Amino acid sequence: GSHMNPPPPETSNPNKPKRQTNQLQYLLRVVLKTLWKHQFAWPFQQPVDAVKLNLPDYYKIIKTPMDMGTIKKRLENNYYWNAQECIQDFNTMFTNCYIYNKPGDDIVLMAEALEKLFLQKINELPTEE
Numbered sequence: 001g002s003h004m005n006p007p008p009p010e011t012s013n014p015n016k017p018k019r020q021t022n023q024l025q026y027l028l029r030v031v032l033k034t035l036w037k038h039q040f041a042w043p044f045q046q047p048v049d050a051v052k053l054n055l056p057d058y059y060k061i062i063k064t065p066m067d068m069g070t071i072k073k074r075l076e077n078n079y080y081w082n083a084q085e086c087i088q089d090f091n092t093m094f095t096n097c098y099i100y101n102k103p104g105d106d107i108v109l110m111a112e113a114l115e116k117l118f119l120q121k122i123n124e125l126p127t128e129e
C-alpha cells in the first residue's frame with residue numbers, strides 16, 4: 001500500500017522456530033474464530049491504515065502495531081513457538097487501541113467487547129499436552 005504506512009508485522013520467517021501446540025490450535029480454532037466473527041471485529045481485521053484514516057501521528061505513537069489479520073496469518077502459517085507469543089499479540093492489539101484513543105471512543109468500546117470475550121476464552125486455554 002502507501003509508503004507512508006509501515007510494513008506490517010512479520011508473518012513469515014524461515015529462521016524463526018515454530019511449533020504446533022494444542023494451545024496454539026485452540027487459539028486458532030476457538031479464540032481467533034470467536035473474535036473474528038464478532039460484530040465489532042472489523043476495525044481490527046487488518047493493520048491500521050493511518051493514511052486512509054488521516055491519522056498521521058498513529059505510527060509515531062504506536063511503535064508496536066498489531067492486528068487480528070496479522071495474528072490470523074501467524075496462526076494459519078504456524079509462525080509461533082508457543083501460546084504466550086500469540087496471547088501477547090492480542091494484548092498488544094488491545095493496548096494499542098487504549099493508548100491511542102480516548103476512553104469511551106467507539107473504537108475503545110469495540111476493543112473492550114473483544115477483550116472481554118478474549119479473556120473468557122483464554123481462561124479456558126487447555127493444559128499444554
Ligand SMILES: COCc1cc(Br)ccn1
Nearest residue numbers: 043048055097100101107
Ligand atoms: C482514530 O482511532 C485510531 C485507531 C483506529 C483503528 Br482502525 C484502530 C485503533 N486506533
